[PDB]
Design a protein around this ligand. Structure first.
Ligand SMILES: C[C@H](O)[C@@H](O)[C@@H](O)[C@H](O)CO
Ligand SMILES: C[C@H](O)[C@@H](O)[C@@H](O)[C@H](O)CO
Ligand SMILES: C[C@H](O)[C@@H](O)[C@@H](O)[C@H](O)CO
Ligand SMILES: [Mn+2]
Ligand SMILES: [Mn+2]
Ligand SMILES: [Mn+2]
Ligand SMILES: [Mn+2]
Ligand SMILES: [Mn+2]
Ligand SMILES: [Mn+2]
Lengths: 589, 589, 589
């Protein structure tokens, strides 16, 4: 399947069914059972793993069962020729280890050994993995807990969860390769994550780094380098669906009516240009702007904003909010992972979750830790339920995907769905629960409109953050938890004394009474940056798998140990202290 | 004592009696007491540690007490000429640290400080260990928990354990240096462990690497290069004591009667040739084959087998079974550590446990994990006792020491004893409980005879595996547990649908509730290879101490932490997380 | 084009035409010129570089000029689907560095900047090379010394050389990836190079490692697993074209007539079996041996031989001689790089030169250094010409491609040509100048037929050796020189007292007066092994470029420094001492 936005095709998953090489007996008796095992997996993935556009992941099965090096090489040729980016080996019998290995060091690989009695399937699993570990080519091992009878094409639940987790993590990793990260502007207000370390993108993600100064937005707005037809349509949509809230700037800080109208115009143009830069726009060709039409093939981008741009032009709250949303004037669509303040690292954090879920991600500041004592002192209210031990106030400085309202609903519960599952009502409710407020000119002299909403509580979420530490490299921290609802009057009091014109999410992380999850305070005290990424659902186990593939250790997370799924090689670096083994395995391999 | 099979003598343990060099009163009053400690330690060791031939380990005590560098040099000189390969320092008083140190880097060393009040014995212990830690020379520290009165030569129980544990691990380590690993054939069916990494053998174990193509067996069989008189006796012994069980090959795969008889002949010859290769055979010289007579001075070897050899000739089951056993047509004898499928890493795994116990080791595949739910479905029987949480099927592809029956007895319990403790009954019953079945031709086209037995339950055992992981090097995993008995009818069903003509051992590992031992399944899912070595008894602690001496980290083990005995410097790398400290200490030291 | 012997297709060279992205005038005026450079480079390469089957290398040009990341991604996508394994960027103007870079790390890349004045072509060259050096992606830089007028498509001579040199080295490198090294037998007589270090094959060459015990030859010979119809033709061809020379074994060591005939039969079968193992044989499938039919997809292999096999069966001289030759009973054909004594390192040495020239390589021992004083004493003859400073006796223990005679001719000069350029006369004379002598039974008890010839003098050659040194890894040594002729009677004396039944080549290396080349003796005293590979022509420079691409340092070579062509980053590690820089660059990059 052609990637609808980026060069080339979407990564495919290749299934390698291995078999015993002995003919005139053994091989013939397993030819059908082994091939059927591969088809079952293909069918499973096709029904559970989907590309960011809603299409089912496409699988490629080897033309024959691999029993030796010849057939293994023919498979590689076929997979490489068909654009396979993830490989899964399946078998019910004994196979000749290294002779049947996938030797491509550049793709995520997993091996599923059938837990049957008739043949040494589990023996090949441990044998080939011993090979993988010994050669230094990480591989995941999949082995079901319960014995199944020969030929059982019904994949057991424990096996399913691993195949899917592996597939999604692998697909996400394969999706980033070859793509660009567009840096619009430079470092923002000294924020570490806004500095671009190419080594990370190139070596860890196989991505490219593109750069463009914000003055480009001036040129494109002045010369009208954008779809003017689309612009008018978007300007009209904004006036029909975006409700303007009260202006909080006090006299001396209030922009005029005329200023506020130009603020909406530029903001809209900014959204169009940022998107045109990221994925290009063929409309620009007939307009005489062929080079601009091309785009930067960026699957993720960032906009510096403060201080240089915002001190004169409207801020990027709307642009940053709309791009990340799952809909706009052109209807429902996939989000455009856009990082506020050019925090490229937070952009990647968001990208990880996006590629693992196909759903909008919320950029946000870890602003305040509210202790049960403080909420009581200030509002007189005693936190209850999930909030009984304190809460964390997540609120970006003005921009956040409209999906963050939590108005999207499934089975009566608040969620964030992939754009392709959205209903007309989901969209309308998100928009109605949002209020655009004039930017606080004391911070943003140029003007703009911030996204003001309150995330519905009770929704399971996962916040995460990728950081780069000298002497260690990239490292990931994860925190699964839920969003909470406070009584209306309590929210108002906490909100008014912070920044009521910005988007709000009340977060409670799942505690474990250990590490940095002993209490709510520790979760925040250990956060390694001012920013984090919020994703609907509990994708922590997924993030852990993905990180291990990328060779990025996880310094902090509250995922139950039984869900941790990493390449077989990790266990050789330690089994009593997984965190320790994670660091040792990442560095060495 | 002279090593009966290999070049040179058996390693000796040297005792160094350190003392306060100060005369005028101090030393004159401590020589007798110090020497008495040395004498006490030698007596203790000679009664508890034995070479693989049953002979008690021989100790050497310094000619004088050691209170300075001159006397220390004198000791080194004597030990070197006396062939010492392990040293133990003893003292009841203060001595001058580095001036009294054993500076040999290639010799396992321990220091025992008397826990007496009169003199600073414990003060010397800590002072000199700090020295060994500063100089980078690992040394074990032994301190008794209960204060003893000056002169008491009764070695406390907690001190005895460590002294013996150190002595055994050290002896095992010293036993391997200079010996060869004979590789017969090359890589077998792509099994990672059949690849020979000379670096490991030379640098960790100080062993030599010898190689010989299996075609050598053809030459010797065709040209009758072997003791023809022994061959006859051997053939006659096999016929009188080896019962041939039912042939499971289905008509289209059955070998004629003529072939089956030839299979026996060649199988017996294979045994003789393999053994002649490992330790030579003076008989060959008389026959005119002087080069062949010499042998490869190998204390451990392996035989490729599949696919090349077994595709035409009788497999090596009988050869691999008889060599590893503690007896044959020539009566009871030490075993010959022999690796199936030329898996040298499992060969070393077996050699480890063999040098620590003097008993036959069982080579086997980690074939199937049987959950209680699975056994209930397949048999309708509910697992009880140690089996209630699940069992692991350990069964090599056809070969296993006859000791593996568990028919040997001590105090009415099943055990595997050192060959020198065997009674004629023990031997007789091991053979009785065993059936030699015609090899499965679909797998082994050239015929042969696999070993079929069922290890008796209730026997304490320890399974282990050495693996080599890229970016880490050698790493060991241990799992202590027990063999179990299953209802006769329950066993038959489970056995018939697996591989009934191969040796079976039902294994249940001890669980800790944490790490790789939260449940039976986890133990198998964390095994880093398809093979393992089974040793009678619980020798995890001994293995851990041995591995620490070899600087080989232990990624997985269920040995109670209180039993962990490692060089003093290990704790300098951490006390809260021994696993992490093990890796740090192994790497830096 | 499809690779005739191995899985998949032959590597293609991709051309990337980079341009200034600026429209409005610049780019519109440079597309034609840029594309023309690409076309010129493709035409040049197709006329000068050829696959090992004589077919001209196939090039692929980007669909559009490359002025940004989008077009660059487009190029990557196309090249990947077109099976490109080597890339060359071309341009006559300035382009945007990193935006136009080829980011594939696993593909040899070069950049050619036009030396024109109109545009900043040379400025792009240096700018993008700096980029490749900063990102750690080696890339060759090609700059012409003479300014050319805009539009000139005539590629200057100095640029042609580098383009072709890069193309050939890159092709050779791309040719090995995915291919297997077949190891038949194990270590031979303790020769370091017969030990297989998978790490090298997998990480430096991207090759697979296959293994098969020599006992396989017994099975196939006994069970007639080979083309019986070809065998007959082969036996008949040997009798009509292979002359049997005098038997040098002295009565007590002569083999009967029956044995000598069997020796021929088995020798011919050995050749067929070895070849069937390397590339399979569809004929085997028809015969019912489908697994055997597949082959091991090996582009290079080795045969242990001594001691195990030769102690009973006919040695592999004929097999090793015929396989490496450019012709046999089936006519002229590409050679089969085959290593004597399973010395895989010499196999790779030969494979290197073979992939750079498409010609048979000569396997040989560096047997004796003959000083002028020594030859004067033993023969009374004074060495003249190139031999005046001494000669080195290169003579393998019995095997050598018949091409080694030097009987092939071009312009009245002795040479070794690619099989596709051979005339019937060439072949006829190679056989005529060769004598097959009965193997020396004192060394090879099982019989056989060694190859006896005398390479003609005056032929330019290059000998080379790849070694693996602990603490360094792979390291290559080169020595260009010439073969020489000695008076007929002088040769006989020197030959008779060495080994007259083995192939002889009198070698004289070029001296530089410095390093390992101050004198003939120094060249041999600095050879790091007993073996070497002899290739026709002076290919040191080509080898150096190939080694730099493989990141394998060259410890010794007599190639004029002006001819050294390495990735641009190499000079960043030093310009005054290229040897030191080579090591620093190989290690860090
Ligand atoms: C207005 C402020 O600069 C605000 O944007 C910052 O505090 C930002 O939230 C830092 O992450
Ligand atoms: C018959 C089979 O090849 C069997 O020997 C293998 O599966 C072996 O158990 C691998 O460890
Ligand atoms: C006959 C000898 O073994 C000969 O083959 C060896 O010396 C060989 O040349 C070693 O390279
Ligand atoms: Mn912020
Ligand atoms: Mn609000
Ligand atoms: Mn096995
Ligand atoms: Mn049985
Ligand atoms: Mn040689
Ligand atoms: Mn000659």
């Amino acid at each position: 399947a052609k990637d609808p936005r980026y060069v080339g095709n979407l990564p495919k998953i290749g299934i390698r069914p291995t078999i015993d090489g002995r003919r005139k007996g053994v091989r013939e008796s397993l030819e059908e059972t082994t091939m059927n095992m591969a088809k079952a997996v293909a069918k499973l993935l096709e029904e559970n793993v989907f590309y960011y556009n809603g299409q089912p992941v496409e699988c490629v099965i080897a033309d024959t069962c691999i029993g030796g090096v010849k057939e293994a090489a023919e498979a590689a040729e076929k997979f490489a020729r068909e654009g396979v980016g993830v490989s899964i080996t399946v078998t019910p019998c004994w196979c000749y280890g290294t002779e049947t290995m996938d030797m491509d060091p550049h793709i995520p690989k997993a091996v599923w050994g059938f837990n049957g009695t008739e043949r040494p399937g589990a023996v090949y699993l441990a044998a080939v993995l011993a090979g993988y570990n010994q050669k230094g080519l990480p591989a995941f091992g999949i082995y079901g807990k319960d014995v199944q009878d020969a030929g059982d094409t019904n994949i057991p639940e424990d096996v399913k969860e691993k195949l899917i987790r592996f597939a999604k993590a692998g697909l996400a990793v394969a999706m980033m390769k070859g793509k660009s990260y567009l840096s619009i502007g430079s470092v923002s207000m000294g924020i570490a994550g806004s500095v671009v370390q190419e080594d990370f993108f190139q070596n860890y993600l196989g991505m490219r780094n593109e750069y463009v100064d914000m003055s480009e937005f001036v040129r494109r707005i002045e010369l009208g380098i954008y779809d003017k037809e689309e612009y008018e349509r978007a300007l009209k949509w904004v006036k029909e669906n975006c409700k303007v809230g009260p202006d909080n700037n006090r006299d001396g800080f209030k922009r005029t009516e005329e200023q506020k109208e130009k603020d909406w115009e530029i903001s809209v143009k900014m959204a169009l240009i940022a998107r045109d830069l990221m994925v290009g726009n063929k409309k620009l060709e007939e307009m005489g702007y062929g080079e601009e039409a091309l785009g930067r093939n960026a699957i993720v981008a960032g906009f510096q904003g403060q201080r240089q741009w915002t001190d004169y032009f409207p801020n990027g709250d709307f642009m940053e909010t709309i791009l990340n949303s799952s809909f706009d004037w052109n209807g429902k669509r996939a989000p455009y992972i856009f990082a506020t303040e050019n925090d490229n690292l937070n952009g990647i954090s968001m990208l990880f979750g996006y590629l693992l879920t196909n759903t909008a991600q919320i950029f946000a500041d870890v602003r305040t830790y509210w202790s049960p004592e403080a909420v009581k002192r200030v509002t007189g209210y005693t936190l209850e339920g999930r909030a009984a031990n304190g809460i964390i106030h997540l609120i970006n400085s003005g921009a956040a995907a409209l999906d963050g309202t939590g108005e999207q609903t499934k089975d009566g519960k608040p969620v964030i769905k992939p754009y392709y599952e959205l209903t007309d009502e989901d969209i309308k409710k998100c928009l109605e629960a949002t209020q655009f407020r004039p930017a606080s000119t004391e911070y943003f002299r140029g003007g703009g409109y911030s996204t003001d909403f309150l995330t519905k509580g009770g929704m399971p979420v996962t916040i995460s953050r990728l950081n780069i530490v000298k002497g260690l490299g990239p490292v990931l921290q994860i925190a699964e938890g839920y969003t909470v609802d406070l009584p209306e009057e309590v929210h108002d009091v906490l909100d008014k004394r912070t920044d009521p014109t910005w988007p709000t999410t009340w977060f409670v992380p799942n505690l474990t009474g250990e590490g940095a999850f002993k209490d709510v305070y520790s979760v925040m005290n250990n956060w390694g940056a001012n920013h984090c990424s919020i994703s609907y659902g509990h994708i922590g186990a997924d993030l852990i798998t993905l990180a291990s593939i990328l060779r990025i250790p996880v310094n902090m997370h509250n995922v139950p140990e039984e869900k941790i799924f990493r390449p077989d090689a990790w266990s050789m670096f330690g089994t009593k202290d997984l965190e320790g083994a994670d660091y040792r395995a990442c560095k060495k391999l």
